[PDB]
């Protein structure tokens, strides 16, 4: 999808957070450069000179993910439709930067200063974009006493959920549901002695595959049924497990008749 140029007014000050490490990679090597915030979209110019453009209106969620109990502080960027740059196609883009009694003492102050310094500048460069762009643009940070521990690609990682999604976007690739997109959420392996299930996302959009988070400790079942009823997402859960597979393709090639013979009521 062919993306408006960026529209650049010199006559003005555009904001602008430095030292910031692309990912994914334009070069074949990691690179850091400058995010500026223009009139339709934002700019990131590598110390080498490479350009990549981020339109306002292909930025499906903004995410702002604070270094708080984390080694790096990252402004995310999922896109409604993908973008060429590193001669790859990317749906998301992202922007990071890295983070005896009396040691220890030196080594918290200096952690604490050094991390408020960078969440003071995160926060800054967010709030002058988001009036730049008259709240249009709206950065989510992540609840991250909500989170959980699951697998949705090959590793444990930490899955957060922000007022309008489920992400991680400290490890590559990075994890994004929208959560009104989602139709349901069905649990498996919800049984005997519990001591981690798996969870399956399924969308209203039944041509897309579902999303499963495998491998999620059972002491955060019920944390995840309240904030799933806080968010109105219905959940159910099983003993087994389904072939998403092939019910999705099933579901795909006939709507109608699914829904005439009992639709999700199967999972009830």
């Excluded at 960026?6 to 957070?17: A, D, E, F, H, Y």
């Excluded at 990691?30 to 700019?43: D, I, K, P, T, Y």
């Excluded at 590193?86 to 883009?93: A, I, L, M, N, S």
């Excluded at 003492?105 to 009036?131: C, D, G, P, S, W």
Aim: hydrophobic residues 40%; charged residues 25%.
């Amino acid at each position: 999808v062919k993306q408006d140029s960026l529209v650049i007014n010199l006559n003005r000050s555009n904001p602008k957070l430095k030292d910031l490490y692309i990912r994914p990679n334009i070069a074949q090597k990691r690179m850091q450069g400058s995010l500026e915030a223009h009139v339709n979209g934002f700019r990131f110019t590598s110390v080498r000179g490479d350009k990549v453009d981020i339109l306002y209106n292909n930025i499906k969620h903004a995410l702002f993910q604070p270094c708080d109990g984390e080694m790096i502080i990252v402004l995310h960027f999922h896109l409604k439709n993908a973008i060429m740059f590193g001669k790859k196609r990317h749906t998301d883009v992202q922007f990071y930067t890295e983070v005896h009694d009396r040691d220890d003492l030196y080594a918290e102050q200096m952690e604490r200063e050094m991390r408020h310094k960078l969440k003071t500048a995160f926060k800054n460069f967010i709030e002058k974009v988001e009036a730049l762009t008259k709240e249009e643009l709206e950065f989510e940070v992540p609840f991250r006493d909500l989170g959980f521990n699951g697998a949705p690609y090959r590793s444990t990682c930490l899955l957060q959920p922000t007022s309008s999604a489920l992400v991680n976007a400290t490890e590559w690739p990075p994890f994004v549901v929208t959560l009104d997109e989602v139709e349901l959420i069905h649990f498996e392996r919800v049984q005997f002695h519990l001591k981690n299930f798996d969870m399956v996302i399924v969308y209203k959009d039944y041509s897309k595959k579902v999303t499963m988070i495998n491998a999620i400790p059972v002491a955060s079942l019920d944390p995840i049924k309240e904030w799933l009823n806080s968010c109105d997402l219905k959940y159910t859960e099983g003993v087994q497990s389904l072939n998403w597979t092939k019910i999705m393709k099933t579901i795909v090639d006939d709507p109608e008749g699914f829904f005439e013979q009992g639709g999700w009521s199967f999972l009830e």
